[PDB]
């Protein structure tokens, strides 16, 4: 029985929560707090360990962008620090390929990154790889066919509907077909061989539309919209369904968790988080 | 019968309050609201008028750092707009020399200013003067011997214990002895020929320590700490005593007002604001 872990986030200030949802029995566990609160971070799992990457601690005292990599061991309920990234990355995207963590984009102060770096757990080392073609913060990242897709975001001037693809073996990036909608701060994930982009902000409105990319036909197609518009949502896939967690709708920090069934093409509300928040990191282990 | 005015501030969002404390009889007056809520602003009095400078507005549409200068006339209980600064300055510091308002540092989005500009009420215009040696936001400013001192703050990557001194006749800055403690968002004022730096944030916790600078010995000395830790506190001097108003202690937005008596070197709590808040502008007239 795998859990959906949610780390950090923002409500009045950046948060330290680590909580895990058990979709089979509907319960929430309260696990050990992050050592430093952050929102705009990303989460992933490698080898049964949970990783919290990047983000920014926004507190009433001021803001601090994060370069931290932290490791959570579910067996010990303990966070441990790992080697930091080369730069701080707020509103980062992350993907895992072959046991390596890729950190893509994000901001540091005025800097909107196009750089990308790769973490190797066996050596506790980060190394830069080829940079993206576009600077992107608030970018969604998905892994499919052992390639890394970077989708949407904000380049420092415009919000983006573009997307691009990284080839680890060749170490190079290529543009792919652009989405139908401009989306910064969407949730992006992979389900049944397609890339989904749910929600985000198009420059005027938080979005409830969802579109998905078929790599062979190279086209983006809308599916059923979510019930609640949302930006800076968390997202993950569990037992063949997409779960979206929290987010900001322009007025409210959401506690709603919606679940997409690709068979029936419908969303249902499955649970609430213990409190509303945006900018969580999310992963399944 | 001079009153302590407190303008604007922050409690879950930027505030529009203008209120005035009478230390002789212990009452609070509710005056006309700022036309635009702001936190992180500074206040000062020139020629019996109250000025509110800079700061940051939270609105449904987003956040806006302020270049505004607004003037409150206590006779008419009315705010009027004056000429705006050259740039927005959130977490600004302000000092007055010879009836001229100096706006120092502060931030505009991710930009951390070292520029300084000077307002002349008689012409209603701003002019830039020589920039500081260090970028500083959350800077405390104090005027002593017709010199302007900028104390502490955040340069965009580090919170500062450094301080520097501005010479209006020569139009230049020189670094002075650094404080014992790193502080951004401290209360800085002049009393009995010493510069005091109270509270603030040292990068780890909110501070309750207070230190004072003697310009002839060039050394900072700790005095009695405040009862409450606080950052983004308001501060002023009234009848030989320092008053600190509000601020954030790490958990709550304080309504406490403490009063420092230098004769006895003790702090006592003298009143509470009508509601807890941080980031106020404070002046006496």
């Amino acid at each position: 029985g795998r859990l959906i872990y949610t780390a950090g986030g923002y409500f009045r200030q950046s948060l330290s929560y680590l909580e895990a949802y058990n979709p089979s029995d509907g319960t929430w566990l309260r696990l050990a707090d992050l050592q430093v609160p952050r929102s705009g971070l990303a989460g992933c799992v490698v080898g049964g360990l949970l990783y919290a990457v990047g983000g920014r601690n926004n507190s009433p005292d001021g803001n601090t962008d994060s370069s931290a990599l932290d490791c959570y061991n579910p067996m010990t309920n303990q966070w441990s620090p790992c080697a930091p990234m080369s730069v701080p990355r707020n509103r980062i995207g992350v993907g895992v390929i072959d046991g390596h963590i890729y950190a893509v984009g994000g901001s540091h102060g005025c800097i909107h990154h196009n750089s990308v770096e790769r973490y190797e757990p066996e050596r506790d080392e980060w190394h830069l790889v080829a940079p993206m073609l576009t600077r992107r913060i608030g970018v969604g990242v998905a892994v499919l066919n052992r390639l890394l897709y970077a989708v949407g975001g904000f380049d420092g001037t415009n919000r983006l509907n573009s997307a691009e693809c990284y080839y680890p073996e060749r170490n190079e990036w290529r543009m792919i077909t652009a989405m139908n909608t401009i989306r910064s701060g969407a949730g992006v994930c992979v389900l049944h061989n397609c890339i989904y982009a749910a929600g985000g902000y198009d420059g005027q409105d938080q979005l409830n539309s969802v579109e998905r990319y078929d790599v062979e036909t190279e086209t983006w197609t809308f599916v059923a919209p979510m019930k609640h518009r949302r930006s800076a949502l968390g997202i993950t896939v569990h037992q063949g369904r997409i779960y979206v967690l929290g987010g900001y709708d322009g007025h409210t920090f959401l506690d709603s968790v919606e679940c997409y069934d690709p068979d029936t093409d419908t969303w249902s509300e499955v649970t609430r988080m213990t409190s509303g928040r945006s900018g969580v990191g999310v992963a399944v282990t | 019968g001079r009153l302590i005015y407190t303008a604007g501030g922050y409690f879950r969002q930027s505030l529009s309050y203008l209120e005035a404390y009478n230390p002789s009889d212990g009452t609070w007056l509710r005056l006309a609201d700022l036309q635009v809520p702001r936190s992180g602003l500074a206040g000062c009095v020139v020629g019996g008028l109250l000025y509110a400078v800079g700061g940051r507005n939270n609105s449904p549409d987003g956040n806006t750092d302020s270049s505004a200068l607004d003037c409150y006339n206590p006779m008419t209980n009315q705010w009027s707009p004056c000429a705006p600064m050259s740039v927005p300055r959130n977490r600004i510091g302000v000092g007055v020399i010879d009836g001229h308002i100096y706006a120092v540092g502060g931030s505009h989005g991710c930009i951390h200013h070292n520029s300084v500009e000077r307002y002349e009420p008689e012409r209603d215009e701003w002019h830039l003067v020589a920039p500081m040696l260090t970028r500083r936001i959350g800077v405390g400013v104090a005027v002593l011997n017709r010199l302007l001192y900028a104390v502490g703050g955040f340069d965009g990557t580090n919170r500062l214990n450094s301080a520097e001194c501005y010479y209006p006749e020569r139009n230049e800055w020189r670094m002075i002895t650094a404080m014992n403690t790193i502080r951004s968002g401290a209360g800085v004022c002049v009393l009995h020929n010493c510069i005091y730096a109270a509270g603030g944030y040292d990068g780890q916790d909110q501070l309750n320590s207070v230190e004072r600078y003697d310009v002839e010995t060039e050394t900072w000395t700790f005095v009695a700490p405040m009862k409450h830790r606080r950052s983004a506190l308001g501060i002023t001097v009234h009848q030989g005593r320092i008053y600190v108003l509000g601020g954030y202690d790490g958990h709550t937005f304080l309504d406490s007002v403490e009063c420092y008596d230098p004769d006895t070197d003790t702090w006592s709590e003298v009143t509470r604001m009508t509601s807890g808040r941080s980031g106020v502008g404070v002046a006496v007239t």
Binding site: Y10, G138, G185, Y248, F253, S278 | N63
Partner: peptide
Amino acid sequence: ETGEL
């Protein structure tokens, strides 16, 4: 996009 102040 994130609701942060």
